[PDB]
Design an enzyme around this catalytic site. Structure first.
Site, PDB file in Angstrom:
ATOM      1  N   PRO A 109       0.818  -1.215   0.000  1.00  0.00           N
ATOM      2  CA  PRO A 109       0.000   0.000   0.000  1.00  0.00           C
ATOM      3  C   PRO A 109       0.848   1.260   0.000  1.00  0.00           C
ATOM      4  O   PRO A 109       1.860   1.352   0.696  1.00  0.00           O
ATOM      5  CB  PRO A 109      -0.811  -0.121   1.294  1.00  0.00           C
ATOM      6  N   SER A 433      21.453 -18.374   6.060  1.00  0.00           N
ATOM      7  CA  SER A 433      22.515 -17.399   6.228  1.00  0.00           C
ATOM      8  C   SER A 433      23.001 -17.429   7.672  1.00  0.00           C
ATOM      9  O   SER A 433      22.580 -18.258   8.481  1.00  0.00           O
ATOM     10  CB  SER A 433      22.027 -16.006   5.849  1.00  0.00           C
ATOM     11  N   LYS A 476      19.880  -6.132   3.515  1.00  0.00           N
ATOM     12  CA  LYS A 476      21.023  -6.354   4.391  1.00  0.00           C
ATOM     13  C   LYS A 476      22.042  -5.236   4.255  1.00  0.00           C
ATOM     14  O   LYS A 476      22.597  -4.765   5.254  1.00  0.00           O
ATOM     15  CB  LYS A 476      21.656  -7.706   4.085  1.00  0.00           C
TER      16      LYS A 476
HETATM   17  N1  LIG Z   1       6.817   7.533  -6.055  1.00  0.00           N
HETATM   18  C1  LIG Z   1       5.971   8.515  -5.670  1.00  0.00           C
HETATM   19  N2  LIG Z   1       6.194   9.795  -6.007  1.00  0.00           N
HETATM   20  C2  LIG Z   1       5.368  10.779  -5.630  1.00  0.00           C
HETATM   21  N3  LIG Z   1       4.269  10.586  -4.898  1.00  0.00           N
HETATM   22  C3  LIG Z   1       3.924   9.350  -4.490  1.00  0.00           C
HETATM   23  C4  LIG Z   1       4.774   8.219  -4.860  1.00  0.00           C
HETATM   24  N4  LIG Z   1       4.207   7.124  -4.330  1.00  0.00           N
HETATM   25  C5  LIG Z   1       3.090   7.522  -3.683  1.00  0.00           C
HETATM   26  N5  LIG Z   1       2.925   8.845  -3.782  1.00  0.00           N
HETATM   27  C6  LIG Z   1       1.812   9.610  -3.187  1.00  0.00           C
HETATM   28  O1  LIG Z   1       1.299   8.843  -2.106  1.00  0.00           O
HETATM   29  C7  LIG Z   1      -0.063   8.502  -2.311  1.00  0.00           C
HETATM   30  C8  LIG Z   1      -0.121   7.015  -2.580  1.00  0.00           C
HETATM   31  O2  LIG Z   1      -1.469   6.629  -2.762  1.00  0.00           O
HETATM   32  P1  LIG Z   1      -1.845   5.605  -3.923  1.00  0.00           P
HETATM   33  O3  LIG Z   1      -3.257   5.880  -4.340  1.00  0.00           O
HETATM   34  O4  LIG Z   1      -0.735   5.611  -4.920  1.00  0.00           O
HETATM   35  O5  LIG Z   1      -1.783   4.206  -3.149  1.00  0.00           O
HETATM   36  P2  LIG Z   1      -1.985   2.814  -3.907  1.00  0.00           P
HETATM   37  O6  LIG Z   1      -0.713   2.554  -4.657  1.00  0.00           O
HETATM   38  O7  LIG Z   1      -3.298   2.871  -4.629  1.00  0.00           O
HETATM   39  O8  LIG Z   1      -2.064   1.759  -2.696  1.00  0.00           O
HETATM   40  P3  LIG Z   1      -3.396   0.969  -2.260  1.00  0.00           P
HETATM   41  O9  LIG Z   1      -4.148   0.681  -3.524  1.00  0.00           O
HETATM   42  O10 LIG Z   1      -2.885  -0.269  -1.587  1.00  0.00           O
HETATM   43  O11 LIG Z   1      -4.087   1.923  -1.332  1.00  0.00           O
HETATM   44  C9  LIG Z   1      -0.541   9.256  -3.527  1.00  0.00           C
HETATM   45  O12 LIG Z   1      -1.325  10.370  -3.110  1.00  0.00           O
HETATM   46  C10 LIG Z   1       0.703   9.766  -4.204  1.00  0.00           C
HETATM   47  O13 LIG Z   1       0.527  11.142  -4.538  1.00  0.00           O
HETATM   48  B1  LIG Z   2      19.260 -15.502   5.869  1.00  0.00           B
HETATM   49  O1  LIG Z   2      19.202 -14.822   4.712  1.00  0.00           O
HETATM   50  O2  LIG Z   2      18.828 -16.744   5.610  1.00  0.00           O
HETATM   51  C1  LIG Z   2      18.849 -14.791   7.220  1.00  0.00           C
HETATM   52  C2  LIG Z   2      19.640 -15.341   8.404  1.00  0.00           C
HETATM   53  C3  LIG Z   2      19.397 -14.416   9.598  1.00  0.00           C
HETATM   54  C4  LIG Z   2      18.664 -15.169  10.699  1.00  0.00           C
HETATM   55  C5  LIG Z   2      20.728 -13.910  10.140  1.00  0.00           C
HETATM   56  N1  LIG Z   2      17.446 -14.934   7.562  1.00  0.00           N
HETATM   57  C6  LIG Z   2      16.623 -13.746   7.526  1.00  0.00           C
HETATM   58  O3  LIG Z   2      17.115 -12.724   7.219  1.00  0.00           O
HETATM   59  C7  LIG Z   2      15.152 -13.764   7.898  1.00  0.00           C
HETATM   60  C8  LIG Z   2      14.306 -13.595   6.649  1.00  0.00           C
HETATM   61  C9  LIG Z   2      14.659 -14.767   5.743  1.00  0.00           C
HETATM   62  C10 LIG Z   2      15.280 -14.546   4.529  1.00  0.00           C
HETATM   63  C11 LIG Z   2      15.605 -15.616   3.716  1.00  0.00           C
HETATM   64  C12 LIG Z   2      15.309 -16.903   4.119  1.00  0.00           C
HETATM   65  C13 LIG Z   2      14.689 -17.123   5.334  1.00  0.00           C
HETATM   66  C14 LIG Z   2      14.366 -16.054   6.147  1.00  0.00           C
HETATM   67  N2  LIG Z   2      15.015 -12.648   8.799  1.00  0.00           N
HETATM   68  C15 LIG Z   2      14.723 -12.917  10.184  1.00  0.00           C
HETATM   69  O4  LIG Z   2      14.600 -14.033  10.536  1.00  0.00           O
HETATM   70  C16 LIG Z   2      14.610 -11.785  11.191  1.00  0.00           C
HETATM   71  C17 LIG Z   2      14.629 -12.071  12.541  1.00  0.00           C
HETATM   72  N3  LIG Z   2      14.548 -11.094  13.422  1.00  0.00           N
HETATM   73  C18 LIG Z   2      14.457  -9.844  13.016  1.00  0.00           C
HETATM   74  C19 LIG Z   2      14.450  -9.563  11.666  1.00  0.00           C
HETATM   75  N4  LIG Z   2      14.532 -10.540  10.785  1.00  0.00           N
END
Ligand SMILES: Nc1ncnc2c1ncn2[C@@H]1O[C@H](COP(=O)(O)OP(=O)(O)OP(=O)(O)O)[C@@H](O)[C@H]1O
Ligand SMILES: *[B]([O])([O])[C]([C][C]([C])[C])[N]C(=O)[C]([C]C1=[C][C]=[C][C]=[C]1)[N]C(=O)C1=[C]N=[C][C]=N1
Ligand SMILES: Nc1ncnc2c1ncn2[C@@H]1O[C@H](COP(=O)(O)OP(=O)(O)O)[C@@H](O)[C@H]1O
Ligand SMILES: [Mg+2]
Lengths: 525, 167
Positions: A109, A433, A476
């Site tokens: 979103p 990792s 990362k």
């Molecule tokens: N890359 C960007 N540059 C400038 N303005 C942005 C950018 N991304 C978002 N905005 C601003 O933030 C708001 C984002 O709302 P938007 O309607 O785009 O959400 P959405 O993508 O429809 O998400 P959702 O459908 O999940 O609500 C808009 O008002 C837009 O003006």
């Molecule tokens: B790695 O890429 O596998 C990594 C190892 C980490 C525990 C040091 N795992 C993660 O980064 C995960 C997300 C994920 C990515 C790829 C495969 C599996 C999982 N992140 C976490 O577990 C985590 C835990 N606490 C806080 C934030 N993120």
């Protein structure tokens, strides 16, 4: 009556399969009487038939530089989408006449999916039309009703064609995944008839009852998650991923769009409330770490309304927002310290993680569990998954082997009972990792040497010591940069992922790409 | 001209029956009204679908192998199976019985192979997706349309097409 309806068919090019229809219907007005119900039924039926733009288009702007300029004016760097619109213009210009695609933008979103359709229609010089589909239950909104019924009406698409006065508009179909599926008239099948290039050339509306050629429209669909879009509908769209943003992208977006609009709203100018860029950087760092920009916009509005109250209540007359009194405007920070250790003791080593709220920086603490220097053990805590426990076992075996080959008279890691902990015991964590991180923790505990201070490392390790690729290199690296890491270590097979990042992300990082663990040992000591 | 639209075409008896009956019933009703156009369209549908119009089948196996080998690189096993099917059909005199079906991973050539089969046998190709509706509606002005198979017949204007029930 007849004169105006037949005159309205002048600046158009009416196809025959509907010109004979309109003629047959005109032949009825002369017979019927101006008092009857059939009279008005056919009168407004002819109104609808003659109001459709039957062959006209818009002066579609097929110039590339102007389109790029108008695209980059409204939004900040949604390159994966602007590139697609520009390639669409280029193709539509190479193969002669105007074209029509069916695109779909999906993403978290607040990333700009719905907001960009209007600027795209301005770039193409098309007539933008929009209607939401989430929660829609009946097909009559897409199709309409037979004109026999009393208050029959055409439907959203025919009304779009009448209101845009063209038949190549840009129809933004919003929320195509939240579409209702009431089967007593299923709107998803009408949307399939709309978005199916093999049959959308003849979209038979239930009121018009003549086919309309919707093959030159640029449909754009917006979804938050693709896994609940109907599968047949999903098999007729080009899924383009509109991902989130990072701290610097968010800062550019704020400065250029969010703060000026919030100032137009709250009625404050930069002489009354100063939001400098250091304040905005601190805000984005400690409060707004999501993917979209709605939360950051709400925070900016919050600071601005609190300053507005300070002024209107006759208390300040001017509000200086400094990075010291930001708590007074937005509250407690959501992310604060960014690293638990400043100087690492002999046992602990910094690793990097992945998260939806940017990256993270976790440490791997190890400690002697029993008083000593029958074989040693490894106890592992910290809410670790199965893959992570297995990787800890693999790292333990390889650390034993490496210390045997490197310092053959150490006897540590073989006769010692060690406890390994990855702190923040409440949060669960998994992944192959941190294998190199665990090997390094064990070795630095065995040798009694702390590793380099500002060093972070990610990578899978095998039983013989090979370093294997990992995922989430972008997050990362962002995390290591944010926590003040100067030297980062990555597997050699992630060189492309690291060099694919934006230049500002990897500005002052000293990266080392390794293949085996002996290189990591030579670096960390 | 409705008689001309099926003059040269061989018509059965109980079809010309309804054709003349509807022409007489249309002379009864008043032109340009909510009763006339319905029966006009129905009588159009009776005089649009062919009855005696065919397509000379391609029985030769060499020509079939050629047209199958032109498009669709590879697929040698599916091609052998199609050739054997055409041989059994040529030797049986007809082509009815079992209904062929191609299954495999997606995007592998299962629709284009049916199009090439249609081009092989000189049958007119027609595809309608089943991803009720195959029987048409009734003439109470709700559904003024026949089914998709009747529309296949009208479109291909041939009594022996190759319909593809895709997916
Ligand atoms: N890359 C960007 N540059 C400038 N303005 C942005 C950018 N991304 C978002 N905005 C601003 O933030 C708001 C984002 O709302 P938007 O309607 O785009 O959400 P959405 O993508 O429809 O998400 P959702 O459908 O999940 O609500 C808009 O008002 C837009 O003006
Ligand atoms: B790695 O890429 O596998 C990594 C190892 C980490 C525990 C040091 N795992 C993660 O980064 C995960 C997300 C994920 C990515 C790829 C495969 C599996 C999982 N992140 C976490 O577990 C985590 C835990 N606490 C806080 C934030 N993120
Ligand atoms: N052996 C082949 N030779 C030539 N083109 C092929 C071959 N196999 C697949 N294709 C092409 O790939 C596409 C396959 O799509 P299709 O077979 O219609 O999907 P599905 O198998 O789901 O019906 C077609 O456009 C076809 O032209
Ligand atoms: Mg939206």
């Amino acid at each position: 009556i007849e004169e105006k309806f037949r005159e309205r068919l002048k600046e158009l090019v009416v196809p025959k399969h509907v010109m004979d229809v309109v003629d047959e219907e005109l032949s009825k007005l002369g017979l019927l009487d101006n008092h009857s119900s059939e009279f008005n039924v056919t009168r407004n039926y002819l109104d609808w038939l003659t109001s459709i733009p039957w062959g006209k288009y818009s002066n579609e702007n097929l110039d590339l530089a102007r389109a790029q300029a108008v695209l980059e004016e409204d939004h900040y760097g949604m390159e994966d989408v602007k590139k697609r619109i520009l390639e669409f213009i280029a193709v539509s210009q190479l193969r002669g006449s105007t074209q029509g695609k069916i695109l779909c933008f999906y993403g978290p979103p607040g990333v700009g999916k719905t907001s960009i359709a209007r600027s795209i229609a301005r770039a193409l010089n098309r007539e933008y039309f929009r209607f939401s589909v989430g929660g829609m239950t009946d097909v009559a909104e897409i199709k309409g009703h037979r004109r026999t019924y009393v208050g029959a009406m055409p439907g959203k698409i025919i009304q779009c064609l009448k209101k845009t006065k063209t038949e190549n508009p840009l129809i933004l179909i919003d929320e195509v995944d939240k579409i209702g599926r009431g089967y007593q008239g299923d709107p998803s099948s009408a949307l399939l008839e709309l978005l199916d290039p093999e049959q959308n050339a003849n979209f038979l509306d239930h009121y018009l009852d003549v086919p309309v050629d919707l093959s030159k429209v640029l449909f754009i669909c917006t979804a938050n998650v693709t896994d609940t879009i109907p599968e047949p509908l999903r098999d007729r769209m080009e899924m383009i991923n509109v991902s989130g943003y990072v701290a610097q992208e968010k800062l550019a977006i704020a400065e250029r769009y969010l703060v000026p609009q919030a100032r137009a709203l709250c009625g404050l100018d930069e002489s009354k409330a100063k939001l400098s860029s250091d304040v905005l950087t601190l805000l984005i760092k400690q409060y707004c770490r999501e993917s979209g920009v709605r939360n950051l916009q709400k925070q900016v509005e919050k600071v601005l309304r609190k300053s507005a109250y300070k002024i209107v209540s006759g208390e300040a007359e001017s509000v200086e927002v400094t990075p010291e009194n930001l708590q007074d405007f937005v509250g407690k920070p959501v992310f604060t310290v960014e690293r638990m250790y400043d100087v690492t003791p002999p046992g602990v080593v910094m690793g990097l993680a992945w998260t939806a709220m940017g990256g993270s920086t976790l440490f791997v603490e190890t400690s002697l569990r029993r008083p000593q220097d029958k074989d040693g053990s490894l106890e592992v805590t910290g809410q670790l998954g199965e893959v992570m426990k297995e990787s800890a076992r693999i790292a333990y075996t390889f650390a034993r082997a490496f210390l045997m080959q490197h310092a053959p008279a150490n006897d540590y890691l073989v006769t010692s009972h060690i406890h390994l902990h990855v702190p923040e015991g409440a949060t669960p964590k998994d992944g192959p990792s941190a294998g190199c991180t665990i090997v390094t923790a064990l070795l630095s505990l065995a040798m009694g040497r702390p590793v380099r201070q500002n060093l972070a490392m990610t990578g899978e390790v095998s039983l013989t010591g090979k370093i294997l690729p990992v995922g989430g290199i972008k997050e990362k690296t962002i995390a290591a940069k944010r926590a003040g890491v100067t030297c980062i270590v990555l597997p050699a097979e992630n060189k492309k992922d690291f060099y694919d990042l934006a230049a500002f992300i990897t500005e002052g990082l000293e990266v080392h790409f390794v293949e085996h663990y002996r290189e990591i040992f030579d670096i960390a000591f």
